[PDB]
Amino acid sequence: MPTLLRVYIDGPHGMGKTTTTQLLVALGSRDDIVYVPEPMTYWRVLGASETIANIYTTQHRLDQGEISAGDAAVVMTSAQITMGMPYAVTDAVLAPHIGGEAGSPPALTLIFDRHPIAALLCYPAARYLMGSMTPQAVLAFVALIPPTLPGTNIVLGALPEDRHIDRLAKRLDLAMLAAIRRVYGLLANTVRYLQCGGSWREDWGQLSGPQSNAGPRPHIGDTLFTLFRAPELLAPNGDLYNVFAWALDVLAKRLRSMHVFILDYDQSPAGCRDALLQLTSGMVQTHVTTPGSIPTICDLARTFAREMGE
Amino acid sequence: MPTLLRVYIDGPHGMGKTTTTQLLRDDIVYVPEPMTYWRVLGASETIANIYTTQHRLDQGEISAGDAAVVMTSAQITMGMPYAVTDAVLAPHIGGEAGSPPALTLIFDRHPIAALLCYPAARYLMGSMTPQAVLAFVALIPPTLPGTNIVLGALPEDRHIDRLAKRQRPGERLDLAMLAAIRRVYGLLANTVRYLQCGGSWREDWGQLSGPRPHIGDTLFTLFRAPELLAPNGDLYNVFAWALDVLAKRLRSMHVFILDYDQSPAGCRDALLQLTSGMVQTHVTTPGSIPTICDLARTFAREMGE
Ligand SMILES: Cc1c(CC(CO)CO)[nH]c(=O)[nH]c1=O
Ligand SMILES: Cc1c(CC(CO)CO)[nH]c(=O)[nH]c1=O
Q: Residues of the signal sequence (chain B)?
């Protein structure tokens, strides 16, 4: 069987992900690489009306005290369903075609503009930090994350906050940028922690008060688990209710088999592109399940690109 | 390796599901309704919020768009317990055993009640958008082997009668909702049959606008909704793909119909007699039963009051 290489470009917005991705797609032959872009059209029209604008409006409303936390949460929870739809449905139809891992050329390369966890974990978690979402709803999105498919290569990105703020500026919510930057830092640390043998249940008690595929085992306090210590999730004895505890187990199982890589976005567009290109070399590939999986997968991505990317 | 029997007792609420299961020490565990999660843990009185919002939309106090936001949000809370239970239980499920079992796990509902059925019903009540319904459908966990689902049968007047004397905290006796929820479950049962008999929604799609149920008698009719179609009437691919997931998830489910129009002793035996044709599965580890028990008893203890 032919092999496949799936690469999910994710991380906080405004670092140059899209540009970088397209520069990488432009290098390869017409059909040996395909790009599944940001489904902006689904977010602005198909799934609902201007989903991004509504989110930023709601937070602003909440900040000025024009609405309550409860109102904010209801809107954000509903908007993240809508924000993650396209990633979720894409994962579900792609799944059956994915076979086991081959090893670090590929008959097909799929570059995605983000992964499901972006909408089912990171943004929600970041909204929790902004007070616009409850920790319970975040764990609800976490329990709904699709089984992590083999060969899940995810590229997170590092960019100094001052450069980030600059690049991002053309609203401008700096509190949110800080929160999304923190959430993605926590995330990469969570993957290394879990890959190093870390057991949240065993280290839980170390709670009080970034490298993904390199370095020593991070402290649970530097992982995503610490966000989930909120009083809402704590039983009268101080311990996590089992429902939320089990959601934390799902979060571990989903991230542990992922392959995360860090891309230095503090360089030029072509610099980023080559940088991303070099990184693909150590990324795990998988076999497809049927002979007709490659063509089918291309159609799916092109169709997705045409209907939802612009 | 030992065998396991999973039985999900679902269907529209208010027919007797709770009584049936109740009447029933180590070869069978009953995972009950996670009422405490809906009233306290997940959020504050979630059934109340749901029914209040429908009512206010009905009275003209709020907008369809307002109801939907609350309604979609509330459905995240309602299904959480089911979704989390499926996710930690999934790993331990092996292949089908064949045609007793070491452990019988009786559940009060399946993830599809919160991810498909209630949301579809709210869509039919105007309190949820069809896109939100398909997003929930995109998140339906994969259908493992041995997914036996018991659905209830009961004449509408009996149902209203039985529902009226068994209201839930914050619930309102809404007859329009009762019809909606009853329509969806009937379509649900027809959909599984359709799919198992070879039905292809893409092939039969044209029959909505001009030995298995007609497509118009399946859950696929609900998605003819204008919000999901392009200017030329074609379904957007995002949605079509969501319908492909629905077909895949439903098709492998084993549906069993339990007649509720009888005494609670009748309904208890009824369910038990239904298990002869339910599909069993192997667990994946030797210590999978014990773990499964803890999960189930703990769930019950913490979320079933
Ligand atoms: C994926 C995602 C985003 C990313 C957007 C910028 O908001 C585009 O990168 N933004 C959100 O507000 N929620 C989400 O789920
Ligand atoms: C499962 C479920 C229900 C059923 C309730 C009573 O309405 C408990 O059986 N009700 C909803 O409104 N959403 C749901 O997901």
A: none
Contacts of B135 in chain A (CB under 8 A): 47, 81-82, 84-85, 88
Contact B138 A89 (CB under 8 A): yes
In Å, what is the CA distance from B232 to each residue of B38, B129, B228, B244?
42, 21, 11, 21
Residue B30: strand pairing partners: B106
- Alpha-carbon span A134 to B40, nearest angstrom: 13
Report residue A32 as tokens.
Answer: 């040996």
Active site residue A38: yes
Residue with tokens 């629905």: B246
Residues of A in contact with B37 (CB under 8 A): 243
Resolution in A: 2.5
Strands B148-153 and B3-9: parallel
The CATH number of whichever domain residue A134 belongs to comes to: 3.40.50.300
Which among B83, B132, B238 has CB closest to A46? B238
- The answer to whether the Cβ–Cβ distance between B138 and A85 falls below 8 Å is yes
The H or E element containing residue B294 is: helix B288-303
What six digits make up the tokens of A195?
Answer: 């890959």
Instruction: Confirm if B257 and B223 have CB atoms less than 8 A apart.
Output: no
Q: Is A133 in the pocket of ligand 1 (CB under 6 A)?
A: no
**A83: exposed, middle or buried (C-beta count within 10 Å: 0-12, 13-18, 19+)?**
buried
- Hey, how many other C-beta atoms are within 10 angstroms of the C-beta on A208? 7
Distance CA B217, CA B199 (A): 12
Across the interface, whether the CB atoms of A253 and B41 are under 8 A apart is answered: no
Domains in chain B: how many in total?
1
- CA dist A249 and B288 (Å) reads 16
- Alpha carbon distance B300, B305 (integer Å): 7
Do residues B109 and B239 touch, judged by C-beta distance below 8 A? no
Distance A37 CA to ligand 1 centre (A): 13
Alpha-carbon distance values, B66 to A74, B127, B171 (Å): 10, 8, 19
Q: Which of B10, B15, B45, B47 to mutate to test the pocket of ligand 2 (most atoms within 8 A of CB)?
A: B47
Top mutation candidate among A62, A123, A154, A265 for ligand 1, by most atoms within 8 Å of CB: A123
Amino acid in the structure at residue B134: L
Would you mind telling me the total number of residues written for chain A in this entry? 310
B6 phi/psi in degrees, rounded to 5: -105, 125
For residue B75, what is the nearest residue in chain A, using CA coordinates?
A78
Query: Distance of alpha carbon A171 from its chain centroid, rounded?
Result: 23
Q: CA-CA distances (angstroms) from residue A129 to A134, B14, B272?
A: 9, 39, 48
Q: Tell me, rounded to whole angstroms, the distance of Cα B88 from its chain centroid.
A: 19
Domain residue limits at A189? 1-310
Residue B92 assigned as binding residue: no
Which residues of chain A neighbour B303 with C-beta distances below 8 Å?
A: 243
Q: Which two tokens stand for residue A58?
A: 């709601």
**Helix, strand or coil, per DSSP, at residue A207:** coil
- Asked if residues B16 and B163 have their Cβ atoms less than 8 Å apart, the reply is no
Token pair of A34 as six digits: 């395909």
Q: Which residue has the tokens 């503009």?
A: A113
Give the technique used to solve this structure: X-ray
